[PDB]
Amino acid sequence: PTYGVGHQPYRVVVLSFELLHAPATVCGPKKSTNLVKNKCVNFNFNGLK
Amino acid sequence: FVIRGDEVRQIAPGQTGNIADYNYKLPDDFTGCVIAWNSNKLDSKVSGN
């Protein structure tokens, strides 16, 4: 406890994503609408504009 | 210089101690570092140094 702030212990957590999005499995929070065909629309399949 | 045991801890920057504050007192912003080791073999007198 008497050590300086420089030598105080720190907890480090490192996250490593894989944005090559081949299977996609850990998709974040959102909500899914229906699918319509043969109409120029804005699609968002798996986070792709 | 030569000191006793607990004062090597007292040496550390920021920490306050009678020997530390009254003799050496490393500054807050410090870019350097210290060496220490036991010297009982060549710095001890039977009657007392």
Side-chain angles (χ1 to χ4, degrees), chain A residues 5-49:
Chain A
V5 55
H7 292 268
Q8 287 180 355
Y10 271 70
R11 289 181 160 189
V12 175
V13 168
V14 175
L15 280 163
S16 165
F17 318 99
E18 293 179 353
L19 269 159
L20 55 88
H21 51 65
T25 175
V26 185
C27 290
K30 228 134 144 34
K31 320 262 350 283
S32 145
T33 316
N34 327 334
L35 174 91
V36 56
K37 300 180 179 66
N38 323 296
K39 280 175 70 68
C40 196
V41 297
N42 296 302
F43 61 92
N44 195 1
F45 278 46
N46 290 318
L48 275 73
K49 300 287 97 175

Side-chain angles (χ1 to χ4, degrees), chain A residues 2 4, chain B residues 13 15:
Chain A
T2 74
Chain B
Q15 187 172 0

Side-chain angles (χ1 to χ4, degrees), chain B residues 22-40:
Chain B
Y22 285 141
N23 306 116
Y24 191 117
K25 182 70 167 322
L26 291 163
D28 291 331
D29 47 345
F30 180 48
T31 45
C33 55
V34 299
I35 310 299
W37 63 96
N38 208 309
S39 47
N40 196 21

